[PDB]
Design a protein around this ligand. Sequence first.
Ligand SMILES: OC[C@H]1O[C@@H](O[C@H]2[C@H](O)[C@@H](O)[C@H](O)O[C@@H]2CO)[C@H](O)[C@@H](O)[C@@H]1O
Ligand SMILES: [Ca+2]
Length: 769
Amino acid sequence: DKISHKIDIPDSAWTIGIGEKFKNAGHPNVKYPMIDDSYVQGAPLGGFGAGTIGRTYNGGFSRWHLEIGKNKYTTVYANQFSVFQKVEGNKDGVAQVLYAGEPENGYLSSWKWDYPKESGMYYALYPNSWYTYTNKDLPVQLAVKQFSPIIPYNYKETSYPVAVFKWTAYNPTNKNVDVSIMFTWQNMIGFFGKQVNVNSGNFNKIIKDKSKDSEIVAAVMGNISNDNEEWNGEYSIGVKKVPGVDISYKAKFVTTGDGSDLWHEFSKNGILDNKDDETPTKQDGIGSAIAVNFKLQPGQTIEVPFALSWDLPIMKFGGGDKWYKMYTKYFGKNGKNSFAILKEALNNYQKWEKMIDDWQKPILSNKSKPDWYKTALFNELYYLADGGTAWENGKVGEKRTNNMFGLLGCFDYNYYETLDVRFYGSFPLVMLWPDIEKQVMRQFADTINVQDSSEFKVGSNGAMAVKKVQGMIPHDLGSSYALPWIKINAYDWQNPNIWKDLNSKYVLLVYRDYVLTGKTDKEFLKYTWKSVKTALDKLKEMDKDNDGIPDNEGIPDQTYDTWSMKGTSAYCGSLWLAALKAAQEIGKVLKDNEAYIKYNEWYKIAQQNFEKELWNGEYYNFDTESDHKDSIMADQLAGQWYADILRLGDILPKDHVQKALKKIYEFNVMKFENGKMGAVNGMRPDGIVDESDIQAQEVWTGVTYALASFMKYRGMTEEAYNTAYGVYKMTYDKSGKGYWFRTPEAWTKDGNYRASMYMRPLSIWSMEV
Ligand SMILES: OC[C@H]1O[C@@H](O[C@H]2[C@H](O)[C@@H](O)[C@H](O)O[C@@H]2CO)[C@H](O)[C@@H](O)[C@@H]1O
Ligand SMILES: [Ca+2]
């Protein structure tokens, strides 16, 4: 490996060998169908709300999130980079697709597949990833840096459906070598959203933009139809000319054929025919190819940028609504703008790289933090782009000031902005894209007094319940299979209108979003104030025994939605205490004296009774009425965790909080698989895991990262990082279970998982407050 010296990969990048087999991989631990796309994954390309494309560590474009809210894992084999090399003096050169695999059928059989093992590495530090190619049959060593412009406090480039592939080629040998790099792409119009005639009318055109010192050659892969539909739009690939490279292209090759129409050209001398051809296809799949060819002398390095864009302006949800995607604000809505997007990227990628470096640098340069923590902190952010992210710029047929946003809880449980989860998972948005965060919270504010009296069948018990109760915060803002932002509470496993955590979490999120954006946004507090008061007042009505605290009802009426709580729970009780303290402070800020007084009175009564009911001398009991009421819950003091972040002080005595955190580390962490797998949710006082429900026997990745941040704020530095380390290890390490770029909700002691690609572990960013 002589190429690594010519590029700048951070030491904290996650790494794996190209073509590496992973032996230890986990699988779903439930009986019902659950997504398991394998460990062959990578950092995604594409902006927020753009639709994303997962290019894996083996080189294939395989995890397709272009249909917003859906996950489709299938390798489109025509989509590749390939290399040609010929040493001066040799008769023939060699050509190789840079993909560690081959197609399942006979299509593209002429191409040289099966990039060999031990010949290159993949590296990821989101939003950047890299591949190096160090192959004994390729005298010129190559590397590529690929990324999308995901930039905190930037709501423009961050939305773009674009990726840059910045290639570096170096000749360490003592002979001249001719080199070509070729990007191939299938015209994917009709890949989704088209019920019939899936390739018909697809056609490819070549664009040559020859303006002084900025020559670009691109293929635009579209359809002859000007229809404005979810399926229609354009893909573009292309390259910018640099000194010492020549560009060649082929507008049209057949992807549903043996591929030799293209490969016979590339394999001969690395130069394509430059044949334009706009003839539309009928049944056959087609694709385009863009290549560069150059001669490298001994010791010479060259850099050349390629790009990919996709202009698919309309997203459709299963309930029938069609929306424009956010990036259409910047490029237009007609779906004929892929070249414009590509051109912006090719002309500005160096600036974008620097903007990314500028945001990563403060963390990466901090030599007090271990590399592994940096690996997890950046790579967990993959989910902000890969979580079915929807970001609208108008309904089709519709202008509003704001652009609604939604991130999925996960794909298996396909609900937008699951609030009991976003309490943990929204830290990166408040910290890095706060205008999105505040918009999402205003979305929730607007739903508080919505009433929907139609009934749904509750999954857990078969009972009928009202869809949405006035004054109760919704569980979620709908499903991609139905109507995001329009039909809320798509979740039906439990009835969220009787949940004891949602209303308190809502208030805590509101106050968090004020505190972590500088305590300046009075107007955000003004917008949300009525909903905050309503939420707490409604939750107070669920106090059955007048101890000042809502009563859990002996069912799973909160985020642990198979783990029943009864009476006063540590979890919902502490959240309630903190929400009351937050509402007191908002009342002071807004000069609402009567609110301050009321919530202060409620807080003092509840705080006294919480302490008396639950403090056992060593920790806070799980609850007051369950069979295993004395279980040690990892999340028992979630309200105090948020109170630290919100700077609300002690809601419980410092001494008792410290004892409880030490107990949790001693038991839930250290007595669960030697503390190498995170914090198990429930442990019995005898040091055996609580078996009352499956969720007690799970480590929740987002709960564990949040607990680590809590420990860190409380000065338990070693404990904090050791607790988080188990989550990192399981996700990323060779000794783990292969969950990189699909961090799950949970795993059990065997390492097998529930719900890959999950929002909650974004809570790692709470460690940076
Ligand atoms: O619906 C989301 C919800 O699913 C829960 O799993 C259920 C599943 O939905 C149901 O179809 C199956 O028959 O039973 C399981 C329970 O064992 C899951 O446990 C929840 O955490 C999740 O929110
Ligand atoms: Ca009560």
